[PDB]
Design a protein around this ligand. Sequence first.
Ligand code: QGL
Ligand code: 2EH
Length: 297
Amino acid sequence: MPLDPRVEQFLAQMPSLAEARQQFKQGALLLDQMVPPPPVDTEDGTVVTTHGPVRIRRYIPDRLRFSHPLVFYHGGGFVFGDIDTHHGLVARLCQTVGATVISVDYSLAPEAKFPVPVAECIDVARWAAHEAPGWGLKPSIVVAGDSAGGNLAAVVSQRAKDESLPIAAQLLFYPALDMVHETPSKRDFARGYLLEADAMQWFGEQYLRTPDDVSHPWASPALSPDLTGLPPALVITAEYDPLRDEGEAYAEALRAAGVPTEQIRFDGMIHGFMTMPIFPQMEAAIEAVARFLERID
Ligand SMILES: CCCC[C@H](CC)COC(=O)c1ccccc1C(=O)O
Ligand SMILES: CCCC[C@H](CC)CO
């Protein structure tokens, strides 16, 4: 399927650690200014985790129409991003679904290494489940994330059982799921579609303790042999994304394990598109999220 016209243009006009973090954040700013987010009530807070205090931001919708909190983990290769860089997405998730959303500022690599952010994300999910009844919501949460954050939501969902954590659904937006295998998509779209091989490698070096960590189930959830009884899954991929094939294979695996699964590929799109509000497909995907969550209760 051909590249989306606007994606094509965006890619055509595409030109230290702390610098690179600031540059990523600048990029998200320029997108937000091009396409402003909806206004939304938010409270900033801090959750006490087993690895320290983790800043969160709670989004409260104008109208509450979904009975479970969402816990959102931002993407950025485990190295970049924060609650601000992903505000544009979370505000829309909050207002379109009409859900409370907890956006999580988990600790970034290389300062924090795998598996520290997994622990933090589980702890925040556990906190949200506990608090939920106090907000007049159900205790079971929905976990959500893009890219690296989709990795985290996938892992938190696999741990859920064992950690006595009620999760009602998982929303995976072009997640990283398999750091061991090369897929066709990872081979064929390795360069020129915003997320590249070089970057993914460098990201892995920042995040992982050793090359052995790639086969760890908390790094590569796609390797887990028993997927039965995992939470209902929405898996959104981009057609021209190195990560596409691992995402779509994992959705196929969930489906065959009897998990209620929706798998949606956005044709002509690239990685990152759900934090790029210059593309209308970002809003279409957010509408997919709201329709999927309607079916949960
Ligand atoms: C204050 C100007 C920011 C600096 C940038 C950097 C080259 C150049 O400004 C623009 O072209 C621009 C402005 C607003 C939103 C998006 C953009 C844009 O880059 O697409
Ligand atoms: C952390 C981003 C993904 C890691 C990469 C995927 C094949 C391997 O190092």
